[PDB]
Design a protein around this ligand. Structure first.
Ligand code: SJ5
Ligand code: SJ5
Lengths: 655, 655
């Protein structure tokens, strides 16, 4: 009677097609075959076909039901076979996809499921280029879905089949259109469709409709909902969601059901005053996050998403840009749950300072880009956290000019979802910046040359020249190795093998001050919350890594800048953090010590003797200058005021 | 006036000799060139020559002083050049070495220091084989040492030049012979040698001697010390050490000085009753630890040693086998500090289940083995934590038979240091087991076949047949991936790609029970405290890794077995830990839950409803059987008794 969702992750037989003999090894999903070679900095890591095969017992009692194989993600092309007969293809590495196998299997026996995954280079599947790894394989879950022959359809771009369209939302009332896809393979007849909105045990809406479904029908039903005096999803202040059950009934029996969240809110972006959520100004304190991790590549487990979100909330993050592609359903779920305003985007990624192009002007590429956009929007439609749809990152006009195609994507986004604005992330001047509703730039003033001050100049000049633009900062950052430490502050070469941590700290303190004074900037996103994989990189403390994270690739170590942001953004958790603790060897005659704290002041101790109190500045920073160390070991301690104080401590050597 | 010790770790120019053009890149020590390729499971990772060059300013005011380059470790051959002229060679990857450069430099200018490091295969430098990576390069610190022309010699196998020989130790008195190497390059004359033993500010011994030193003299002075009613170094109970200052004086001026610890104790090993420290029985709750780590290979920083020791102490470790080679001075220092009884060993490593040999019977190999043993003993002589010198690991008699050579090494160890017993780690029957004073075996009953019970049978039969042997277990362990989880307990294939965590947990619980009942076993050492690198491995959740750690390779995650040992070994820190939390998906009709706790009992809750209390067994384990889950999410909580209880919690899905 109930819909079943069966995980098919364990024990698949794997081999590369370049291994011609046919023998296989066991693997377990999520899986990528690029977790060792790409992460070792091998620039020509394996990009081609890997094959997964599993024997699936089709239970006799599933006869009469409908059966679907749903894939959460396979990078980048998947060809699926049942009993070695081809059933379909998916092109795109980040969107879910589904095939019905109801009439393709033999009931009561083992059937072969074969997936031939290809992450070889293509010129007709975005992303074509990018500063990250194109990890190959079935790197998200695989499900066997089992439903009634009359069901809420899972066949609409592999979405849940329900779109809760937020037409009008205010504190007085919300009008929602529940769009429901129905799929019928039963004999001609009827069913009753019910849409139930609840808050815990309390019933908020219950709307019903009798529907006549022809054999073979695949149709869209639209049920209007009205909620009086709604409780709004209000970011981290109150991430409230209703639950919606959508169900089908025949003769007073429920025969199918799906649940989706309903987090109601309204928003706008003001060119002069920034982002407003539910009628109130909201600074977007944002970071970016790639979907990979040390040692496992992009084969992330649920605890990895959970941990990433825990670290961001610890830091006081209230906004995120999930670059550079559609990410996991579970990850958008955590954004919903924790109230994090989210920018979600398609992988329409340009070259940046590197070679080749993000756009190749041929129908196959362009049609496939539209498919990946429709996938993004339909598959992730109901997540309240998503407040912006991103259409590109660092495209450029030279050669194949993407401006007209990006206009087509913008119009398609607005058609698919008029309830959210489009955005984009640019490193260019010119017409590419004037298509999406909001615009943002990737700025590295003070890292890739210049000084942080030119970010202030760029922001002010652009805002004055183009007062209609809603200006954001879609990336800003600096590299750091936790193993590169020096007593003095000196700007390093960005592309070199020396990325002292103190420069990243300096960079973020200076850039944050510029942002904090400019409320017309509707959101800013640190590049990046975590170090991440990019095989071609040859910089910092090891190849193959982009080290602009606030936290290391294995999520183990928070860099000093993490705590600068935590003090400023997470003000209600008491803390004190001494900066430059990893710089154990000191040689400067005049030592400077610096702490980040939520307290109004702090006290410094050197070798157990107080150096006195210093006040925190407006950026939660306390600084002591001309501190005198003695030759050899020195114990440095900082303490907040109060009867029960907080402390941080380190032993440094002075010579 | 003072001895100077200057770190030369930053900014060296590096290239491989296979890169013939001559251009270089910046590197910073500690460094290995095998941190990416070997750790990616590349079995033919780079083994050959890497070159490091640094310009060193020789200060005019160093003229008249003596200058030394001291290397803490270079794997495996180092050729050192000053202004591109060869000054010496070291063969051996784990012992320190030193060259005087006093008369080789130009004062008042930059001098070139060039180190040509080679980790290419050799048949004349142990280890010849082994289940670990032979990471190449200058992977420990480099120092410039500056002393008076008359000094406590740093030239005796690069040791501190002072051996505090523990002749007789008891609670009534300790007799120590302070052996001091003196090196003179001043004009013929005299100096006063002082040996000062202190406890904080309190003076315990002060012995002095006037010495006549010819020009060019390199001599040994021996000063007897007598300490009445000493405070003994007593393991974790009281890791007390005196400090010894050894100084040279001319005309009432101190001209040189070195400090060494003096941790006084006595011990013996009883064939029937196990290890006795300072006259009292002491169970050795041991683990093993390799000197590498995720992402950095063996280029460990001080915080890495510190963290490894923190994790071991957290687990209640009181003994360690620092396999399979001499490890860092700083690491033995931490063992001294924290009271951990230590087995230190030379890299005389045999093949185990793999090919080739640990012993090649040729003079060059054998003489070099003796050098590495003398290095080990002289360089690490004064560490109280070291209570055993290990001479080999898994050698075998077939082909080149090492028995007679190992007897030579045993006699050499006893000559170099009669104050500690020799030991060895065997996987063989026969004559190899009857050479060293203590013997131990590497046992994998229940992992590499058989069942844990045959360990009990082996231990009892050996002990009965050979009542004179002091029997230990130098390794025991099982593999586990934290990403391999299954609801049921089933023994996996050791060499396969599936290492469910629950089997490692089962293995350690069963083996520990066998050990705990057998006090004639003087020490046991878990293989291994941490997952570690072994490029040739193809098992568990990724290639290139030996996953028998209780803690993951990046030191981030403690496996369930870590907490079993912590509950049993660290009884005075209150804790409760629910096992199998990583096994999120449950399907067994009858669920079993298991907790490790220091409490006498604990209570289980399922979906907020108590299932009742259960008593902890003698191994700190609480178990609830036939627990009923409901379909879908279940919240599982366990709690200790008391007004302020401890808790552990997890959400599992049942289907
Ligand atoms: O250079 C960087 O670190 C960033 C530049 N903008 C685009 C990002 O993908 C890239 O990673
Ligand atoms: O097989 C194992 O895991 C161990 C067997 N004994 C020797 C170790 O070096 C090795 O790692």
């Amino acid at each position: 009677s109930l819909r079943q969702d069966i995980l098919l992750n364990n024990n698949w037989n794997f081999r590369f097609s370049h291994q011609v003999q046919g023998d296989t090894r066991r693997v377990d999903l999520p899986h990528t075959w690029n977790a060792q070679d790409a992460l070792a900095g091998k620039i020509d890591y394996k990009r081609g076909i890997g094959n997964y095969e599993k024997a699936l017992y089709i239970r006799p009692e599933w006869k009469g039901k409908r059966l679907f194989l749903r894939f959460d993600g396979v990078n980048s092309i998947a060809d699926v076979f049942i009993n070695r007969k081809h059933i379909g293809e998916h092109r795109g590495g980040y969107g879910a996809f589904i095939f019905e196998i109801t009439d393709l299997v033999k009931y009561g026996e083992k059937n072969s499921v074969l997936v031939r995954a290809n992450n070889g280079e293509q010129l007709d599947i975005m992303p074509l280029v990018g500063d990250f790894n194109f990890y190959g394989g079935i790197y998200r879950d695989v499900h066997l879905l089992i439903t009634d022959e009359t069901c809420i359809s899972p066949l609409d771009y592999a979405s849940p089949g329900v779109y809760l369209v937020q037409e009008v939302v205010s504190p007085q009332e919300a009008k929602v259109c529940a769009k429901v896809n129905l799929s019928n393979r039963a004999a001609d007849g009827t069913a009753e469709l019910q849409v139930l909105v609840t808050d815990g045990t309390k019933v908020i809406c219950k709307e019903s409709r009798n529907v006549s479904l022809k054999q073979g029908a695949d149709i869209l039903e639209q049920l209007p909902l009205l909620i009086q005096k709604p409780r709004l999803w209000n970011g981290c202040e109150d991430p409230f969601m209703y639950q919606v059950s959508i169900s089908l009934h025949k003769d007073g029996k429920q025969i199918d059901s799906v649940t989706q969240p309903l987090g109601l809110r309204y928003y706008h972006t003001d060119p002069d005053k920034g982002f407003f959520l539910n009628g109130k100004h909201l600074p977007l304190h944002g970071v970016c996050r790639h979907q990979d991790r040390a040692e496992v590549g992009n084969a992330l487990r649920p605890q990895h998403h959970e941990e990433d979100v825990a670290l961001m909330r610890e830091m006081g993050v209230n906004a995120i840009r999930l670059a550079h592609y559609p990410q996991a359903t579970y990850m958008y779920d955590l954004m919903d749950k924790h109230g994090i305003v989210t920018w979600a985007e398609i992988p329409f990624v340009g070259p940046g300072g590197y070679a080749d192009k993000g756009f190749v002007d041929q129908a196959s590429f362009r049609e496939n880009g539209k498919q990946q956009l429709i996938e993004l929007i339909r598959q992730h439609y109901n997540h309240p956290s998503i407040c912006f749809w991103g259409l590109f990152n660092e495209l450029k006009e030279v050669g194949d000019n993407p401006v007209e195609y990006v206009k087509e994507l913008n119009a398609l986004a607005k058609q698919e979802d008029p309830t959210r604005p489009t955005t984009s992330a640019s490193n260019q001047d010119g017409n590419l910046n004037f298509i999406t509703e909001n615009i943002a730039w990737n700025r590295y003033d003070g890292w890739y040359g210049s000084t942080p001050k030119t970010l202030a100049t760029f922001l002010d000049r652009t805002h004055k020249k183009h007062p209609e633009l809603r200006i954001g900062i879609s990336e800003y950052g600096a590299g750091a190795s936790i193993y590169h430490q020096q007593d003095s502050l000196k700007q390093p070469s960005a592309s070199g093998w020396w990325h002292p941590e103190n420069w990243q700290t300096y960079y973020h303190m200076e850039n944050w001050k510029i942002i904090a004074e400019r409320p017309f900037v509707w959101g800013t996103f640190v590049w990046n919350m975590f170090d991440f994989g990019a095989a071609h990189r040859t910089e910092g403390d090891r190849p193959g890594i982009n080290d602009k994270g606030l936290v290391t690739f294995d999520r183990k170590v928070r860099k000093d800048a993490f705590y600068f942001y935590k003090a400023n953004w997470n003000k209600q958790e008491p803390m004190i953090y001494l900066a430059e603790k990893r710089c154990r060897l000191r040689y400067q005659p005049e030592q400077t010590f610096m702490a980040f704290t939520t307290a109004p002041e702090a006290e410094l101790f050197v070798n157990g003797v107080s150096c006195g109190k210093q006040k925190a500045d407006t950026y939660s920073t306390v600084v002591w200058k001309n501190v005198k160390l003695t030759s050899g070991e020195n114990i440095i301690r900082v303490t907040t005021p109060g009867k029960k104080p907080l402390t941080d401590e380190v032993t440094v050597e002075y010579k």
